Amino acid sequence: ANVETVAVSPTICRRGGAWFASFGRERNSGTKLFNISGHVNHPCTVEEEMSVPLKELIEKHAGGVIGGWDNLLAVIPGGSSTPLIPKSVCETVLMDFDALVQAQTGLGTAAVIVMDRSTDIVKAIARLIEFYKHESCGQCTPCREGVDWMNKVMARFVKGDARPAEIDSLWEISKQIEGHTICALGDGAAWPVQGLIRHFRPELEERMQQFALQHQ
Amino acid sequence: ASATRVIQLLRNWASGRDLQAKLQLRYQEISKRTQPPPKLPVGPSHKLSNNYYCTR
Ligand SMILES: Cc1cc2nc3c(=O)[nH]c(=O)nc-3n(C[C@H](O)[C@H](O)[C@H](O)COP(=O)(O)O)c2cc1C
Numbered sequence: 001a002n003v004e005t006v007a008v009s010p011t012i013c014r015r016g017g018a019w020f021a022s023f024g025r026e027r028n029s030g031t032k033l034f035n036i037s038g039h040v041n042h043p044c045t046v047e048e049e050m051s052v053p054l055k056e057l058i059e060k061h062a063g064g065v066i067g068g069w070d071n072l073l074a075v076i077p078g079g080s081s082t083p084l085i086p087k088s089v090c091e092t093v094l095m096d097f098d099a100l101v102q103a104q105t106g107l108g109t110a111a112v113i114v115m116d117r118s119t120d121i122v123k124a125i126a127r128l129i130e131f132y133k134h135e136s137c138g139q140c141t142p143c144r145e146g147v148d149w150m151n152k153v154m155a156r157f158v159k160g161d162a163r164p165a166e167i168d169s170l171w172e173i174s175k176q177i178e179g180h181t182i183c184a185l186g187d188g189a190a191w192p193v194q195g196l197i198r199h200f201r202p203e204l205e206e207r208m209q210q211f212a213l214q215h216q
Numbered sequence: 217a218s219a220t221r222v223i224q225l226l227r228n229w230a231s232g233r234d235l236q237a238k239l240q241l242r243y244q245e246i247s248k249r250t251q252p253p254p255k256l257p258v259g260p261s262h263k264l265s266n267n268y269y270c271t272r
């Protein structure tokens with residue numbers, strides 16, 4: 001059991017399950033710790049009710065996005081394993097399991113990472129993939145080989161060496177890792193690239209265009 | 217051919233057709249024995265995605 005889950009249990013016993021279930025939406029009960037980091041004025045850790053909207057949490061406890069809310073580019077809501085969401089989704093999304101699942105991003109550890117409009121999103125996702133490549137235990141074939149493969153592909157994506165067709169290839173590669181490994185680390189490596197391709201494909205395409213035009 | 221015009225006329229009268237137009241021996245209208253390199257396209261299964269072997 002997670003330490004937060006173990007640590008909230010005596011309070012639940014003392015005050016009752018009804019008190020804990022009074023907070024949040026149905027099937028999303030209780031309070032939660034949030035770590036807001038990245039491009040915020042006041043990165044911090046707070047305790048808040050579950051279904052709090054993301055924008056309200058960011059602008060109330062983290063001092064708002066650096067440069068204003070209109071400077072927001074993307075948010076990773078639940079740690080590196082969750083897919084990122086663009087600014088248009090963060091306007092009304094709530095911070096619980098169900099709402100973030102409907103947003104195709106998941107809640108995870110409730111670790112909000114904020115990236116503003118000055119962020120190279122491709123570089124950030126490639127750094128996350130490098131982290132997963134360095135953290136893979138190597139036991140099973142899909143993680144051990146495919147995560148390294150996607151790391152190389154994303155490293156080439158950062159410069160722009162690749163061709164647009166490879167993007168689809170990358171997608172398929174991630175699909176061959178997800179659901180085919182012993183543990184969920186493979187899923188946690190496959191999902192960030194899926195989110196980046198889902199929401200920022202034109203950025204990758206224009207990077208490849210600029211690389212081709214610069215290097216004949 | 218190198219035949220003199222009188223021999224050409226004799227050949228054409230004997231055969232009944234103009235032989236100089238369609239000669240059995242090929243002189244210089246054939247292709248060069250040295251050619252530029254080719255390129256040779258690949259094929260329909262050379263895609264990078266949506267190409268699972270179980271579908272083909
Ligand atoms: C690669 C990987 C790393 C994980 N690391 C942690 C971790 O550091 N701490 C943690 O509490 N759970 C971690 N988890 C999730 C554990 O499965 C989880 O702690 C466990 O299921 C406890 O369940 P609980 O959240 O109901 O208490 C990790 C899962 C994966 C796949």
Ligand code: SF4
Binds near residue numbers: 135136181182
């Ligand atoms: S998916 Fe899990 S078990 Fe398989 S290689 Fe990666 S870390 Fe090891």
